[PDB]
Amino acid sequence: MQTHAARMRTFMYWPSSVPVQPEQLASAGFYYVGRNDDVKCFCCDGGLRCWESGDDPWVEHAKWFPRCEFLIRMKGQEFVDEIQGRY
């Protein structure tokens, strides 16, 4: 699940009702595990479910799994710090 294309392919059977797009999930390192709306990050193995309207996957990534190596490398410690309430 190291590549964007491999993560995107797992969303081929992603439910239509979920108000979060596969493109944005896969960019933030998530892939659909083929269960409800459960996704896991390829890097930290952080699991996320119950995706609501207006959810930004990068924000959810930094909110619940701030120590993820991929999240830090892509978004940076400053972004992670902000999401954790540190300005």
Is residue 43 a contact point for Zn ion (CB under 5 A)? yes
Distance between CA atoms of 27 and 39, rounded to whole angstroms? 13
Binding mask 52-81 for Zn ion (x = CB under 5 A): -------------x--x-------------
What are the tokens at 58? Answer: 């990068």
HSE-CB at 14 with a 13 A cutoff on CA atoms is: 22
Q: With respect to Zn ion, which residue has the nearer C-beta, 17 or 83? A: 83
| End-to-end CA separation in angstroms for the chain | 33
Q: Which stretch binds Zn ion (CB under 5 A): 6-14, 42-50, 52-60, 73-81?
A: 42-50
Give the binding site for Zn ion (CB under 5 A). 41, 43-44, 46, 65, 68
